[PDB]
Design a protein around this ligand. Sequence first.
Ligand SMILES: CC(C)CN(C[C@@H](O)[C@H](Cc1ccccc1)NC(=O)O[C@H]1CO[C@H]2OCC[C@H]21)S(=O)(=O)c1ccc(N)cc1
Lengths: 99, 99
Amino acid sequence: PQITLWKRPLVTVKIEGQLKEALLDTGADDTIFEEMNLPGRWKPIIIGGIGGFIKVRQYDQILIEICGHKAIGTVVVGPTPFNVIGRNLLTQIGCTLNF
Amino acid sequence: PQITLWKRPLVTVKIEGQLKEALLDTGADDTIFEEMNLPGRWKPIIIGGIGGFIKVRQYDQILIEICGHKAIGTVVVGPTPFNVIGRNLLTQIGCTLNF
Ligand SMILES: CC(C)CN(C[C@@H](O)[C@H](Cc1ccccc1)NC(=O)O[C@H]1CO[C@H]2OCC[C@H]21)S(=O)(=O)c1ccc(N)cc1
């Protein structure tokens, strides 16, 4: 689909059988979600944004189906105000900026 | 232009006669740059990110020429790690996400 930027680019996402709405974020290198359980071993890491840093649990080879397109990649879980689909998964679905 | 997301979507921008590189950020509602001087009256405001909040000076009707395309809108000045072009200005240049 083509997505204008007049409203937040939110998309419905299915992850580990759960339905969530996530932000298509070209400014995010990685994907981060609110607190939730995920398969596989995780490593505690820290990510930095505008105004500070947060501790998060890193998961690898996580399946996400975002707006009907499937992708596997690293997914980070922590206290984020919004679920963010970062470039690590945007590339997988063939997402591009165009103007 | 078409912009894939394998690398950071950095673009060269001219603002107040200054040359800067800025991040095309679909996850940012507003545009914010590192410390710099700008015309017009400003109001101190606060913005929130992934790991906290920062105090910033808000400027309205600021001209930016991003990749050769012109836009006027609110520009926020504060301690951001990267210059970010938010949706308030992305919409003006006709920026869209496509997949
Ligand atoms: C630090 C910047 C490069 C911005 N980043 C992505 C960006 O889209 C965030 C994504 C985002 C969105 C909502 C809340 C927090 C973070 N938005 C943002 O910070 O914008 C702020 C300025 O305009 C305001 O609009 C809301 C946020 C404010 S980030 O959240 O910190 C980030 C950094 C690293 C990773 N792996 C993932 C995300």
